[PDB]
Every structure is written in structure tokens, then in C-alpha cells.
């Protein structure tokens, strides 16, 4: 009866406390990602170990600008990820495209291509409003897998 809703203080605390983010370097924004894993603001060892292969991940991250020829590549990679997946865009160019938003060869927005969750806003987000964009996503698991099996 009540055991389920106490069980989700385990499984919904496990998936939020270990993340294996992929990253996409593409454009300027990649360097202000690196400095999140450099020792100043130290990304790993605060619970999130940095890049792994495409298969083993949970949260992919889009930096950079997405042209036409990169779209056929992304949408494929987003699939293969396992279940408990999310997409956290960052930078002013995954939100509606920085500038270049009027260009010919830039997709406009990268929400169009995938179901994106959290956003961050500015050429490079300051390597700070990154982590405070994740401490949104570790607080964006308040969800319960109870009340699907156990209501309907």
C-alpha cells in the first residue's frame, strides 16, 4: 500500500545521483564545458562522471551550432541511449540559434529535432549557469513511477 511510495525514495534517488553525460563539442561553447571538468568548478566527483561512449550514457548535452548536415547525425545518437534519458541543451545556439538564426544552413533551434528538457541562455553560459542548470535536473526528478502501475 505505502511500500511503493517509500520505494521511490530509492529508485528516484538512484537515477538522479549518478549521471553519465555525453557531451557534444561543436562550437565555442565546448571550452566552457571543459572548465566545468577542470579543477576550479569540478564537475566530476560532485556525482557526475564525465564523457562515456554513446551506449552507456543518460543525459546527452548539446553545445554549439547545429547545421543541416549535423541533424541526421544527432537524431540517430539520441535514440540509442537507454531509457532514463534526457536532453539538456545549453548555449544560446541550441535555444533558437544564437545568431545564425536567419542563416540558410543552420537548423533553427534544436528543440525541433529532439524533445529537449532544460535550457540555458548565453554565449558561453558562464560555466556556472551550467551547473545551476543541472541542479535543476537533479531537482527535476521529483517524479514518481508510482501512480501509473498503482493508480490506473
Amino acid at each position: 500500500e505505502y511500500v511503493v511510495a517509500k520505494l521511490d525514495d530509492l529508485i528516484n534517488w538512484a537515477r538522479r545521483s549518478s549521471l553519465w553525460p555525453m557531451t557534444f563539442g561543436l562550437a565555442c561553447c565546448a571550452v566552457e564545458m571543459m572548465h566545468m571538468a577542470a579543477p576550479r568548478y569540478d564537475m566530476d566527483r560532485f556525482g557526475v562522471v564525465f564523457r562515456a561512449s554513446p551506449r552507456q550514457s543518460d543525459v546527452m548535452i548539446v553545445a554549439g551550432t547545429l547545421t543541416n548536415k549535423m541533424a541526421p547525425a544527432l537524431r540517430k545518437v539520441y535514440d540509442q541511449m537507454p531509457e532514463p534519458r534526457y536532453v539538456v541543451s545549453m548555449g544560446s545556439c541550441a535555444n533558437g540559434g544564437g545568431y545564425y538564426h536567419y542563416s540558410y544552413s543552420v537548423v533553427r533551434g534544436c528543440d525541433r529535432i529532439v524533445p529537449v528538457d532544460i535550457y540555458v541562455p548565453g554565449c558561453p553560459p558562464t560555466a556556472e549557469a551550467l551547473l545551476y542548470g543541472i541542479l535543476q535536473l537533479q531537482k527535476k526528478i521529483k517524479r514518481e513511477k508510482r501512480l501509473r502501475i498503482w493508480y490506473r
Partner: protein, 309 residues
């Protein structure tokens, strides 16, 4: 009032609402309203994250989500108050361990046939099935033909729809087969007689609605959905092995979501082709689609390359 061209980021003046619209069918309709422009208010029951795979469907500020239960007479009254057309796909397979299933085709489709009628919707719509007949069959197939009777009372204008057995991409109809790696294929019931029904391809049904969605001039007047040619054989169950070359679940697993040794086995062989006099399709057309050509796509198995069919 419709503006511009129908590409995306356009208007085309219709709002909507689509109840259900998570599982196989509803996801595949809204995707045709996230194109020609709309305001598609899709509510949903329990699922916070299972609805995301939908969101890159309408452009921006088109589709919008709410939360509802459906036995509360308010939850259906808070949304619809602003709407033009509202269709209804709601309902499912097996009796739930919670919902007793009896009136969920009776009370629910009426519970949303509450103030919707009152509040001034229009072109309200509902679903039927080609095989549901109020004579005695079939325990699930019954209670569905009650809605055609019981619910039609309300909202004299419906254009309630009557399609066949459908085969989609992720659909469970033709996919119950080929999942049958098992002690062996045993037809229902070990007879090659009355297979098969009218297997229309899921595009044409979901292109029917939006063709009646502003039709005009179909309201109250119900239609039924032609299959392709023509009836079909036993070979359909052989055809599966001819080419195949032989939401909100859980964290670990689901206790019971079975093959249902119940109506399920007998719902598939009930056949009963029925009245032609319904208009019912080319009039709402123009669509009809075959089987032989469109059944490779949805069927891909452990060869993944050879076909030569």
C-alpha cells in the same frame, strides 16, 4: 480564420482537444495537427515523462498539456470550455485491477459527453469498431456497441466513426503475431476459416479524422472505414512468418499485462464483416491502402536484410 500556408507556424483557425492521445493511436493523430496548425490541447492521465516524445510535434506554443482523472466531472470541464472540435479515442484493452471496465466505455465517454455538449463544443466525435454488435459478443467487444446506442442519445451531431482492424507501426494488432515464438503458431481456434478482417493502414484512419475535422457537413452522420481488397485468408498468419523468416510500466517489470486468456483470443476471431451502406470512406476520402506492400516496413526481424518475397 485560416492564414497563409499550411506548413507550420501557421494558424488554420481550428482549435481541438484530443483526450487519451498517448498510446498508439492518439500519438499518431496529433502529429497530423502539429503540422497544418492548430491549438491541440492534449490532456493525459498519470504520465509526466511518457508524454515528452511528443513535444517536437507542434511548432511553439501550439500543443499544451493539462492533467486530469476523468471520473471527476470538473477535470473535463476546465479544459474544453474553449474549443472547436473535440474528438475522443479514449478507452483500451483488458479490464483494469482498478477501473472495473464496465462503464469506461459508458460513463467515461459520457463523462466527457457532459458539459462538452453543454458548453458549446461542436463536431464532437467518438470511436466505434467495425465488429462490435450488440448481439451476444464479445465480452470486451461488447460495451463498445453500447456507446453507439447509449451515448449517441446525447450530442445529436457526432459523425461517430467505425473502422476495422488496423495495422500501424508500433501497433499491437498485427504484432500479437510474430511475438508468438512459442510452442507453435496455433490459429484461432486452430482453424483457418474466417481470417481475416479489413486491415486498413493506420495512416488512412488518421487521415480520415482531419478530413472530417472540418469536413464540412458531416455531423450526426456516422461513417465506417473500408479496408483494402478484399476480405483475406488464413495466409495472413502464414504471411507473418512468410516475410519475418520465422508507457508508465515500472522500473523492473509489470505484474500482469498479459495475452489475456479471455476475450483477447476470441476478439481476434469474431470476424463479422458488416453493413456496406455506410458511406463510409471514399466519401470522407480520398484514401485506401493495401497490405502486401506495407507489411515489410513494420516487420523487420533477425535477418534484417533478405526479403525476396
Amino acid at each position: 480564420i485560416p492564414h497563409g500556408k499550411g506548413g507550420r507556424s501557421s494558424v488554420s483557425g481550428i482549435v481541438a482537444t484530443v483526450f487519451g492521445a498517448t498510446g498508439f493511436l492518439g500519438r499518431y493523430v496529433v502529429n497530423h495537427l502539429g503540422r497544418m496548425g492548430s491549438q491541440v490541447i492534449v490532456p493525459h492521465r498519470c504520465e509526466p515523462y511518457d508524454t515528452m516524445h511528443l513535444r517536437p510535434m507542434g511548432d511553439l506554443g501550439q500543443i499544451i498539456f493539462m492533467d486530469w482523472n476523468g471520473r471527476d466531472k470538473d477535470s473535463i470541464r476546465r479544459a474544453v470550455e474553449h474549443s472547436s472540435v473535440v474528438i475522443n479515442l479514449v478507452g483500451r484493452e483488458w479490464e483494469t485491477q482498478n477501473f472495473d471496465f464496465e462503464d469506461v466505455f459508458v460513463k467515461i465517454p459520457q463523462a466527457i459527453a457532459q458539459v462538452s455538449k453543454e458548453a458549446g463544443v461542436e463536431k464532437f466525435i467518438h470511436i466505434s469498431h467495425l465488429n462490435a454488435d450488440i448481439k451476444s459478443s464479445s465480452k470486451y467487444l461488447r460495451s463498445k456497441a453500447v456507446g453507439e446506442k447509449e451515448v449517441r442519445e446525447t450530442f445529436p451531431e457526432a459523425t461517430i466513426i467505425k473502422p476495422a482492424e488496423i495495422f500501424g507501426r508500433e501497433d499491437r494488432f498485427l504484432n500479437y503475431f510474430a511475438n508468438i515464438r512459442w510452442f507453435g503458431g496455433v490459429p484461432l481456434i486452430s482453424l483457418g476459416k474466417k481470417t481475416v478482417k479489413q486491415p486498413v493502414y493506420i495512416v488512412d484512419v488518421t487521415k480520415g479524422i482531419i478530413n472530417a475535422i472540418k469536413d464540412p457537413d458531416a455531423r450526426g452522420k456516422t461513417f465506417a472505414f473500408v479496408g483494402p481488397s478484399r476480405y483475406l485468408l488464413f495466409d495472413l498468419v502464414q504471411y507473418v512468418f512468410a516475410v519475418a523468416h520465422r508507457i508508465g510500466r515500472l522500473f523492473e517489470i509489470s505484474p500482469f499485462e498479459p495475452w489475456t486468456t479471455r476475450d483477447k483470443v476470441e476478439r481476434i476471431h469474431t470476424t463479422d464483416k458488416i453493413l456496406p451502406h455506410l458511406p463510409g470512406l471514399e466519401d470522407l476520402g480520398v484514401e485506401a491502402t493495401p497490405l502486401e506492400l506495407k507489411a515489410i516496413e513494420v516487420l523487420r526481424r533477425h535477418r534484417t536484410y533478405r526479403w525476396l518475397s
